[PDB]
Amino acid sequence: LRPIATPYPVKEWLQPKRYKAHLMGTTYVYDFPELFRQASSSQWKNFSADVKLTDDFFISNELIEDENGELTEVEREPGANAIGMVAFKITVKTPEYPRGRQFVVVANDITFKIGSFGPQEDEFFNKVTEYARKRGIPRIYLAANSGARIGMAEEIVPLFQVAWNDAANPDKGFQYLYLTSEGMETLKKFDKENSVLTERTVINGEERFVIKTIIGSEDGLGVECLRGSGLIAGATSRAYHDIFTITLVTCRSVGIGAYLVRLGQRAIQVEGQPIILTGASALNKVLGREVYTSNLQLGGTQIMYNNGVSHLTAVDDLAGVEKIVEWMSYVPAKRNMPVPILETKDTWDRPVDFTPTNDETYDVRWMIEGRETESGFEYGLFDKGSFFETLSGWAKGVVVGRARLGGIPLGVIGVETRTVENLIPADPANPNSAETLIQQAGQVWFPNSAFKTAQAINDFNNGEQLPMMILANWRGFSGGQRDMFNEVLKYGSFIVDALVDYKQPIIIYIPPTGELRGGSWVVVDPTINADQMEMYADVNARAGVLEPEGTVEIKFRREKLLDTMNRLDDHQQISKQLADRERELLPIYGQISLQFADLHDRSSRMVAKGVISKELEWTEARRFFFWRLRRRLNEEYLIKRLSHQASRLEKIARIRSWYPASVDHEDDRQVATWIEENYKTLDDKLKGLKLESFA
Amino acid sequence: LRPIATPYPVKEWLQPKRYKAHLMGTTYVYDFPELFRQASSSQWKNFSADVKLTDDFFISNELIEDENGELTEVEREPGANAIGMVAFKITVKTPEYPRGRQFVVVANDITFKIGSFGPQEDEFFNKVTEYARKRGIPRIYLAANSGARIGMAEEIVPLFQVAWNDAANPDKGFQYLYLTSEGMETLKKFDKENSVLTERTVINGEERFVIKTIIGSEDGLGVECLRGSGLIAGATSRAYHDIFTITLVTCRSVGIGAYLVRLGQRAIQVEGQPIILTGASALNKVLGREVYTSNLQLGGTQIMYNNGVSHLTAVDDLAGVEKIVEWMSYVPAKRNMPVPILETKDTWDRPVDFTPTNDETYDVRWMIEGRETESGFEYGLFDKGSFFETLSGWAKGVVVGRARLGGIPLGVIGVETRTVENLIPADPANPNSAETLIQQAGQVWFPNSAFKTAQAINDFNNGEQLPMMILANWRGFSGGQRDMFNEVLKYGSFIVDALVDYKQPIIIYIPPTGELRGGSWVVVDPTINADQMEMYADVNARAGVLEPEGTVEIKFRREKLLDTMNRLDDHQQISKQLADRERELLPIYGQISLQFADLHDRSSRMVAKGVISKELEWTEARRFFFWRLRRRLNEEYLIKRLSHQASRLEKIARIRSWYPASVDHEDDRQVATWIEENYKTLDDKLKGLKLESFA
Numbered sequence A, B: 001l002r003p004i005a006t007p008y009p010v011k012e013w014l015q016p017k018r019y020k021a022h023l024m025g026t027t028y029v030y031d032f033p034e035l036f037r038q039a040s041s042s043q044w045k046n047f048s049a050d051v052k053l054t055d056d057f058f059i060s061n062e063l064i065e066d067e068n069g070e071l072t073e074v075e076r077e078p079g080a081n082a083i084g085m086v087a088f089k090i091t092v093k094t095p096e097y098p099r100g101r102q103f104v105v106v107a108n109d110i111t112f113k114i115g116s117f118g119p120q121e122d123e124f125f126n127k128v129t130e131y132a133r134k135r136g137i138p139r140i141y142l143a144a145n146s147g148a149r150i151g152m153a154e155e156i157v158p159l160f161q162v163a164w165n166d167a168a169n170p171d172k173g174f175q176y177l178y179l180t181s182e183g184m185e186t187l188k189k190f191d192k193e194n195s196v197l198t199e200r201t202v203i204n205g206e207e208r209f210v211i212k213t214i215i216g217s218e219d220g221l222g223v224e225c226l227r228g229s230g231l232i233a234g235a236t237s238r239a240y241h242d243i244f245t246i247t248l249v250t251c252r253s254v255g256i257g258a259y260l261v262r263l264g265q266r267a268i269q270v271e272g273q274p275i276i277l278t279g280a281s282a283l284n285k286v287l288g289r290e291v292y293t294s295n296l297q298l299g300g301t302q303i304m305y306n307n308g309v310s311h312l313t314a315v316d317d318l319a320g321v322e323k324i325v326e327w328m329s330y331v332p333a334k335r336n337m338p339v340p341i342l343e344t345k346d347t348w349d350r351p352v353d354f355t356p357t358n359d360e361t362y363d364v365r366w367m368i369e370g371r372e373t374e375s376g377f378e379y380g381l382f383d384k385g386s387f388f389e390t391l392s393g394w395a396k397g398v399v400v401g402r403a404r405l406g407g408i409p410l411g412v413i414g415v416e417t418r419t420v421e422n423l424i425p426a427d428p429a430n431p432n433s434a435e436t437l438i439q440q441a442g443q444v445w446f447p448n449s450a451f452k453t454a455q456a457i458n459d460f461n462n463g464e465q466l467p468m469m470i471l472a473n474w475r476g477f478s479g480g481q482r483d484m485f486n487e488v489l490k491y492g493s494f495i496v497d498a499l500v501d502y503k504q505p506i507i508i509y510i511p512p513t514g515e516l517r518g519g520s521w522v523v524v525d526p527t528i529n530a531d532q533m534e535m536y537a538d539v540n541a542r543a544g545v546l547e548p549e550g551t552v553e554i555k556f557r558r559e560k561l562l563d564t565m566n567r568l569d570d571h572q573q574i575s576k577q578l579a580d581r582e583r584e585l586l587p588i589y590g591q592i593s594l595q596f597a598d599l600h601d602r603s604s605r606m607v608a609k610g611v612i613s614k615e616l617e618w619t620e621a622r623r624f625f626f627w628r629l630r631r632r633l634n635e636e637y638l639i640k641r642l643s644h645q646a647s648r649l650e651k652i653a654r655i656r657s658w659y660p661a662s663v664d665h666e667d668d669r670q671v672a673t674w675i676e677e678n679y680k681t682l683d684d685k686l687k688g689l690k691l692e693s694f695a
Ligand SMILES: Cc1cc2c(cc1C)C(=O)CC1(CCN(C(=O)c3cc(C)c4[nH]ncc4c3)CC1)O2
Pocket: A441, A444, A475, A476, A477, A478, A479, A480, A517, A545, A546, A547, A549, A550, A551, A553, B278, B281, B282, B283, B285, B286
């Protein structure tokens, strides 16, 4: 016992495994429920400082398999785990769910065989994933592992013999490995006969049992671990389309561990904890040079956070757990439950303060969440303090995160207007490799930012089941050689596919000073998903096939400009006199044609042509969007009830035929108010529509 | 008329539009059905030279919209198209479908407003896509376009006035653009009042109508084309998951045109025909330097074929059409129809000739399709001449294509064992940029080859609805810094997702001399999709978590080697004598431990542990796989009929309970033979199982 004379018992001595976990730079697996209790308690503190919490606000029950392999809740002492994978079912009262929300936490035990995945760990991880999927509840994975378990048949190590070419000179080589009748009997004695595949041979009267295959008696040596790895890789792929999945890399995450991080998609990496496939020393053996110094060069946050594998980084385990809890606050309690409303001090009924200017550089985050100025706080479109940015280390030209609009959670995509620089590190494996600095112009979709956009759309849709707003402000895709070679078309197409799959309301809004051109409009048009998408443009937004310079270059050429010079009152001395005035007003007539082109690019044309639902004023956008979204969520709820009993067009027309004659279908507030006052009446209607018998 | 005195009429004079198409380096849209007739006729020639074809083997009917906008078949003269998009419904008798197969061909008319997409072209393209989707038939798109249609309100060009700051000095600027009562009357006269949005103002007694927005009277100027672009982008996204889609880039393909190529996924690019987003000259204006010389630098085959956007290249239009027809020969006639069997001279009942050797370099294509040697043809696993390689210009470390196994079509994925070099071109936009040569070791998955693998899996599954074989031979994923930074985890995870979605039988086979290790096994394990996947390993294959060098480094260290030195019969003079023999046999004891490790890595262990279905011998693999696949396709057909009337496990157990008691469930040939002799009897059974009434 070390140390002696502590006020309370030494937890690292009561359970030496806790001390082993700490030596390896991570939290002991049985101490993670306490971190979730601390993080959940903090959630309440930042929400309402005055609320009084008792320990019954948080329940954590360990999950273990019974005799029939069925998961059951247990209360036992830490360190009693017979396998290297542990799970907990957590029931927490949170600001969004004051009566309680549940989730499962699965975690490797880094103290159990270096957190390696053997067949029993794979089977348990899969059972826990299926448990969460069946219930529709989130699955949190805490990664601290060494990949698939490796081993040899240890019982064959002291028994095997080698059939030397020349018994006197071992350096001359050998023909095969074999067992004697003695070794074969040792195996028969311990019932390990099936540990080897032998072919009986007689050499100089002596009977040699040639080793054809080593199988081993212990399960968890090779390919059986690899099979279990594929099982959990497939299970995690499926879990991502079904429930909310998130991973915290709390110590190293190796091989299958690294794949699980990516397959669950949502990943928080603790600083200094690597996500790797093969370790640096093994890579050095294969390369035949000391190419890499550490595993952090291969899978540290400067790799994984910068390339988007890690959505966030955390300074320590508790910071990571806090980020999970915060991410979950935007997510429904379980699959197909409504998005969790959380009204705060910042109410819907207010104008939007921060306004972007054409002559001044702005951070898109100010438009989203507002900004602190010397004269006070300028409110953004969304609730003050509600913006939770993710994938912040990668493709910084697009800004993605979760926010709240009068308490309604949603995914947000914004465009960074400032030039973005990213540094490609020098490849240690190549001597002719130096670090590259890539500059990417603002408001242009590049391969990485097009990929980030599609990824964001998919992550809001799957598991999170959130509505979304895209503050659409792109000039187009980068059509240059390097970006075309780097497959910008592939990544741009992923955006389209992501939108086609979207199951919650989407609002596309070209903001003030914003633009949507040829290539960028295509990929975000509401006809891609008419059931879910709506487009709006600010009164101060622009949209056209080309920018005005482009339209002029193609459709307002020299001849047209010269015919227009016949607005200005003005053979050899005349030809030089015409060319004198023609060179004089060409700069101003260029501005005239540019302005003529720009007059087609307005929200009024967009309205007249029926390509946008409405033109809006930025200051009034929060009030407008709050009721449009609230009304859309209410109607979406009614369409789904109708479905559990026809095209969408027929469904919504039937629901709207139930609205009183006096209700204006175009008034969002009135429609939302009527539905919410009549949910139980509409239920009676839906239940009566059970006069359903159709062949 | 030029030229005069030709034996037959001058088609380019009868229809001047045909001549315009030729001047632009492409086939005239109304001449493409003739190319399909030529290509289909050639298909018959290469199949059975002796078959006599009459013109009724091929029917092509143009599709146009009626008064109600419904598509109808017409017989009219070329060039009568009132829109820049044309379509044909083709009915062809082919070797796979001698009674006929149908498909739709949609094409831009490059002679109609430079093949630009206006709202009517977008609407027609969408209607044709829906037409094909409803019928389940393939949609071929022939790309020859200029992107979305651009324009200005031409009626406002001769009427608009400018409100100068100083009428005497135009160079001093202007305040706005306006109309006079005269211009407003001209608009009222031609019923173009709504062409402008004006605000009435009185300046020095004169009434000026300030132009607030130009709308135009002509539809197809701006954002309405962009809306139509999004519509067809979404429609093509959907078509890809539903029907067989393919594109031939026959002239330039711009903007929405470029996106349509990628969204239909399967793309054949004619040499010298660019796939671009923005043209070189427009990019030069934005960059303020003459950075690019041609559109081919941006989207030629050296960009698109090399990055995998173009699956194939073609020398001309007919070569492209031939490749479409050849690709289609592996594809069902329509959605959910069985895969088209096409038995040729190369029958199932033969051994596999070409065998890979560990000591000799081989081309994986020899294992697939066989090879010509001086002593005759060495047959591969698949039918002679049946390998149709796709995505051949990109990520050459993986070999993908379609093949036939005793006539059964399937997708094939193989591993290139030779080192692959790809040249990244120097970026013209950056002066500090030089061409890079990337070398990638064989049997290692890199980001591009992991992406190609996932893409191949998806393309065989969607539209093609093919079974698949993966000749799995990977050491793992590249875990190095550059490949980890370049997101190898993301691309590796796409493989898992692709397999989870697979709806036809899959065979994973580790071939002779082949290997599957830690990272590579995970991503291809049959537990990822148990309903469709099966794994097999050759008697001469290897599989383990690590390569033997790795297992030894972790589980057969110095101490274990020294304890093993007690197999060799041999204080200050003794310590130097022990270290003398210890340095002597360390190289051979290293080989002993490597061999001990390798003995665990065999197909016999894989069988004993239940991770593979069977161990096979390469020479007998064609006979084995033909019947396993044929039997799997028959059982898959029965499970589907049961579904249209329970888990898969319950379904297959019910179907197998119908087999006579004497049928061995494990005998593929016997099971396949029994099903095919009894299809109509099994139908009677399925129809009698209509005593189905369940709440
Ligand atoms: C800064 C940046 C912006 C870009 C691009 C890349 C970068 C690096 C792209 O590749 C796309 C683009 C290209 C210019 N865009 C046009 O509409 C356009 C078109 C024509 C015909 C033009 N003639 N003259 C000017 C002009 C402008 C907007 C879209 O914007």
